[PDB]
Amino acid sequence: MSYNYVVTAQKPTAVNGCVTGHFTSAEDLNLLIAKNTRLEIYVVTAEGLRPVKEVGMYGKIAVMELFRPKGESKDLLFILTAKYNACILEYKQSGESIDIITRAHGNVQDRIGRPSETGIIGIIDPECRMIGLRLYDGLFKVIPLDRDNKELKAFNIRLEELHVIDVKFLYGCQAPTICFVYQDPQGRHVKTYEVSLREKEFNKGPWKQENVEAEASMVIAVPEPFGGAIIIGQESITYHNGDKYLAIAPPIIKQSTIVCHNRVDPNGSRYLLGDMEGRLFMLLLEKEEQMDGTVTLKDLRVELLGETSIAECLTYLDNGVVFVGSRLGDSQLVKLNVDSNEQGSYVVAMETFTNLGPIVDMCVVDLERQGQGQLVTCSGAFKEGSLRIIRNGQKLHIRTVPLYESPRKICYQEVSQCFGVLSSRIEVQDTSGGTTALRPSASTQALSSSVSSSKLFSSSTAPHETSFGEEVEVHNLLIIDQHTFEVLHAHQFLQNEYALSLVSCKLGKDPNTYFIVGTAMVYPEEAEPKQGRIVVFQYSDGKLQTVAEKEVKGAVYSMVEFNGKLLASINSTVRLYEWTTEKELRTECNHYNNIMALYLKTKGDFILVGDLMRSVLLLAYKPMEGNFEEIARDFNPNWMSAVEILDDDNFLGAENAFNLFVCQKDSAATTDEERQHLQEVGLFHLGEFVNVFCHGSLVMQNLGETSTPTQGSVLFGTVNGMIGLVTSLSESWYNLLLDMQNRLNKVIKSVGKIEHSFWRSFHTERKTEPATGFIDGDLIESFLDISRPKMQEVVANLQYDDGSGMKREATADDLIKVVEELTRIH
Amino acid sequence: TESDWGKRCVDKFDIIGIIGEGTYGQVYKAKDKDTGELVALKKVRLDNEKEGFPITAIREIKILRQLIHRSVVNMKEIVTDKQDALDFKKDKGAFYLVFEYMDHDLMGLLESGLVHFSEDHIKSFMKQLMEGLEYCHKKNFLHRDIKCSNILLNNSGQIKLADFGLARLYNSEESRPYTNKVITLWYRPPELLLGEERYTPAIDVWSCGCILGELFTKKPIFQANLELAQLELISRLCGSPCPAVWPDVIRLPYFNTMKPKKQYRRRLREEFSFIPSAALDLLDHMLTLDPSKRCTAEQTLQSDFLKDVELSKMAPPDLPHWQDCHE
Amino acid sequence: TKPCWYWDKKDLAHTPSQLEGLDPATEARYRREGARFIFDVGTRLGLHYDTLATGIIYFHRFYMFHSFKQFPRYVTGACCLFLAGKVEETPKKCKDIIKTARSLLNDVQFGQFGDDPKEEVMVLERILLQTIKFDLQVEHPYQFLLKYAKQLKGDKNKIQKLVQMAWTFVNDSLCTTLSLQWEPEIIAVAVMYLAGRLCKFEIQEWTSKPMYRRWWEQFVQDVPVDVLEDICHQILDLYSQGKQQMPH
C-alpha cells in the first residue's frame, strides 16, 4: 500500500576480494577487484592499472577465482553469490565492444544444511578438474568441470569433520585432495582427504592428521616444487608435507593477527602476509636440494617489510607493486623496494584508492553556506579511521580527515562552529600497570584535553585483573572545527566506559547549547551492561566543561532531542528526561516493552523505537497525561540495524540480513487491533548493511527547485561504503516504473543469468519473500545506457494511468525524459 | 481464596505493552502490583457474542487449569474488566487469562541466524520439550499444533509449551492470508495433510521432530505454501507414502488425490549426515510416516540422545546481549 | 490450586434457595427437573453421555451459589448444556438448544426464557463461568465403572448385567445431590455395590483378591460401608418415591 524508490548515490567502495589472472588478454595479466555486487577488471601496467571494464552483478560476490581449463586460451572466471548463484564467465572483446559471456550458471543451494561459521569457501583444483565448495557444516560440494556441465550440477560428499576452518586444494598430488584445518573438542588439526569424481566420495589422503595451533586460521597451498601446505596461526607458522614438518614462531607476529596471504613468487619461495595492525610481512622459504636433485624446505623466515592499509586481500602485480585492498581503509598500490629507506621501511605508497570504509554514522550539514548540503561520515576503523566530506557539484568530491582511531558517532553543533565526534582507540596493558597506545591519534593530538573525574562508579569492589598484552578500548569525545577540521579538544571517558550515543541540542529553558553523551560501563564479565552515564557537556572558549551527569542502570544506546526534552534508551527502558532550572536531568516517563531499544527516531510527539529482535515500535508522548503510549508495533521478528521515519504513517527499517522494509499504520481502521498492527507494506533486499539513516540530500536547489516526482530524501550509509537514497512515490508513478522494471528485466542481459526478481527478493535464511513497495532505481537508471533497439522494445505496448490523460502510452524518448529527471535526485 | 478465579479485576495488573495479538483479543505483558511478578495477559472478548466464549479459549482454559509441569506454560488466574454489580446482563466486559511471562520464542531467536545451539543445548531443549509433551499426552491432552512460535523459552534456559488455544498471531489489513496457518503447515504431519483422520498424539511428535532438525540447521526442514508442495518436500526426504512403509495409507482420503511427483526413496540420513548419530537416530524415528510406527513421547525420552541428559545441568543457551553494535 | 466441589448433606439445608423460603422438597424437585431437562434436551440432540453429565454437574454446582427464585432453572440448564458442549468437544449452536428446549417444554415452562431465549442464555454464560470458578474439568462415574469392571474376570453375562444395572443407577444419580456430596470414584463403587446386592452377586470372587470381602478397597481406598450404604439409600429412595422400580 506504500510506494518508495531506492537508488545508489555512491557505489560500494570496499575491497571484498582480489585475484589476478589472464582473463581479458590471454597475453596480459589482469587484476580483478571485487566490491559487493560490483566487479572491476584491470590490466597491469608498469605505472599502475588501466581499467578495462566494470560490470554489475545481481548478488554479493562471495567467491572469485580465475582458472583456465585445458583447451582454453584465456583464464575463465568463476563467481558464486551469497544467495548461492554460481556461474562461469568469459571476456569477449569484439573490437571496441565489450561483452561478459555467461558460459555456465546455476543455483547450488541445498534444501537442507547448516550455514558454516567461517563462511562460504571456494577453491579450484590446479588441474581445473573440479570446483570445491564448503557451504554447510559436514558437507563438501563438488562441481565437476566437464564440458557438458553447463548447468553446474553438483553432488555432496559426507564430511566427518563438521567444524572446518579453511581448505585449499593441494599442489602436486597425484589425485586431487583437500587440506582442511578443523576444530573438534581436542583442539584443531590439519587433515587431508582425496576427492574422487568416479567414486564420488573421499579416499584416505597422504597424511592422516597433525596437531596444529589452537588458532590456526589460514591454509596456504604451496606450489608443486615445494609441495605440501603452510598453516598460519596467531603465534606460529607451520609447513606440513607428510614426514616433513617445519615450525617457525617469530615473536613479531604474535602482536597482531594475520588475515591475508599472497604468492609473491610463482615457484613459491616468497609469500606475503598482512596483519590487523597493517604491517606487511614477507614469508621466506629456504630451499635445500637433495643430492638426487630434489628440493626440501630447509627453513621458514618472516621479515617485516613495512606498513600498509589493513588488508582484507593482497595481490601482486609482478612489477614490484602490490595492491592492498581494504574493507576498513583506503586501498593502495605499494612498492616493495630491495633497499630500505632511512626509516627502515621497504614499502612506499604509490596511489591511494578512496574507501568510504564502514560508515558507522553520518550527518548532513551545509558547512560552506551553499544552501545545498554536505555529508560528513564516520569512516574507517583502527588506524584507517577518518572523517569524509562529500558534495554533489560528474563526481562526488571526498575530503578525508585522518583520525588514526575508530570513529563511533558524529553530530554537528552550529553554535560552536564545530563537530562533536565519539571515537575509540586501542591501548594495550603495559608493564607499568597502565596502558600504552600503539600510535598517536586524534584523542591524543588534541590542542586541549580533559579526563573524566566522575566518581559515580568508584566503589566498584569488583575483580578485573589486568594481564599484560591485552587490548582495551579508550573512548573519547572529540571537538572538531568545521572549516579546518582541527581537533580542538578531547575528553577521555572513564576506564571501561564506552561512548554509544551523542547529541547536540538546547534543553528546556536553558539557552546554552550542550554536547550530551550516553555511555555504558563495559566489563568482560557482563552479558549486558548494567551501569551507564548520561553526561552533559558545554563547549565554550576552547574548553569542554561537564555541566551535569545522570547515572543509569544500563547502556544508553541511543538519544535524541524531543521537544526540549531528552529522550534516551537504557537497555530495555525508553525514558524521557526533563532539564530542570537547576541544570540537572529529571525523569518524566518510561516505557519498558522492549528487549533492547537500540535505535530511536522522532517526529512531533511520535517516536519510532527499533528493538533488537521485535522490529520497530511506534510510541507517542501523550502530553495531557505525561506518559508514553503504544500506537502500534510490528509483530514481525526481524532484527534491526537502523531505523528511520519517512512520514507520520510510513516507517523504514533495515534488517541484519541486508533487507530494507517499510511499515505503515492501518489508518485508524475500525478494529483496535488493526490500529495497533504495523503492516509490512514494503520489502526489499538491498544487499548492504545500513549503519545509519539520515534525512536530506546533497543536490543543490537554488530556491525551491522541486521539479521532481520523487517526494522526500533519506540518505543511508553502509559497511562497504555505499551511500544510497530512499524516497517516496505516488501510486501512479510507482506502477509506471514497476511495469517498466518488468519490461527492463526481460530486455537486459544479467551477468551470470541471474534473475533480477530473485536478487531483490527479501531473503532471511529462514524465509524468502517477493520484494514489494520498492523500485530498484539502479535498474530504472540503466534504461539510459541500453541500446536504442532495446529502448524501443521496452516502451512497446506501454500504458499509463492517472496521467494527464488517464489512459496513455509513451515512446522511447518520453521515458528517457523521466529517467534523466530521476538521475538528478543524487 | 486463590482457587476462586474470575473475581479479581485486571486493575491489579499494570500493563507494560502488547507483546502479541490474538484472534479474539490481544496479549499484553504486565506486572502484578502486589506480587511484583511479570505476567502475560490473554484477552478474550465475548462482546460479539456470536457463539459465546470461544471454544479455542475454553480448550486453553481446560487443559492448562490442571497442568503445572515445568516444561508447559502455566495459567495463574483469570481476571475481568471493571464490572458493574447491578446486573451482569448489562456487563459485556472482557476476560483476561494470566500466564507466566516468557522472554523469547524459539522462532525469534532463530530468525536472527546469529544464535548458536550446540549439541548440549539441543539436548537440554528437547528433553524439556518431550517431558512436557509426555505429561500432557499421559493426561490425554494433545497440542494439535506445535510450532516454533509456540515454543517459548526464557533467558535462563527453561523451555515451555504454549498456545494450546488462542494463538498469539493476528493478520490484519492486506497481507498473506492465514500467515499463522502457513507456519502451522511447516510442522503439520503427513497424515493430516493426506486426510482429516482423527487427532492422534503422533501429530504432536512429528512437529517436534521437525523442530529437532530445525535446531541443527536454524531453518525449518519443510517450508511450503500449499499442502501438495509440502507433501512433496516431505517425500523428497522421508520417501513417498506407499503401502510398502504405510499399510494404512490407502484408508486416508487423499492418498490417490494428493500424490508426490514421484515415488522417492528415503534420504533423511544422507541429507542430515552432518548430525550426531545419537540425534540422527531420533530424527529418523520421529519422522516416520505411519502414525502407529512413529515413536511415542516416552520413547523419545528413553532415546540415547535424551535419556542420559542431566536435567540439573541447565547449561544456559548463548544469546547475544552484547556486540549488537557489530563488526 | 483447585477448589473444593463437595459439601455435606447437612449443608444442603443452607443453599440460597432454602434461605429464600424454598423448602427442601421443592429444591430437590427443581434439581431433578433441571437435570432431566438437560438430560432430555441433550439426548434429543444426540450428545455423548459425558456432555450430558458435565452440564448436569455445572447445573447442580450452580445452585449451591444462587437461588432458584432468582435464576429460572431451565435457562440455567440450557446454558450449562451449551457450555458443556464446548468443554467436552461436542459443541452445539445455542439456537439449536433453544429449538430443542421449546419442543420439550410447554408454553408456561418456556416462559422462563423470556422474549429473547437465545439472549437470556448467552448472557448467563458469563455468570456460569465465574460461578464454577472456571474449573471446567469434571470426571464422571462412567469412566470408573468401566475401569473397575475391566479388572473383573468371571461370567461375562453376570458382569455385563452388573454394569448396565450400575450404569442405569449412575444416570439416576445425576438427578440428586450425590454429585455434590461424594467424588465420582466413590459413586462408581457405590453403584457396583448396589447392583451386586440386588443381583445376589459376590463381586469379590471376580477380583484378583477373591477372599477380600471388601472388594472395593482395591479400587477406592478409605471408603467405609457407611458411605456406600448412604449413597445407595438415596439412589433407591428416588425409585420408591417414583412409580418406577429397580431395573433388574
Ligand SMILES: CC1=CN[C@@H](NC(=O)[C@H]2CSCN2C(=O)c2ccc(C)o2)S1
Ligand atoms: C503466554 C505467554 C507468556 N510469555 C510470552 N512471551 C512473549 O510474549 C515473548 C516471546 S514471543 C514475543 N515475546 C515478547 O516478550 C515480546 C513481544 C514484543 C516484545 C518487545 O517482546 S506469551
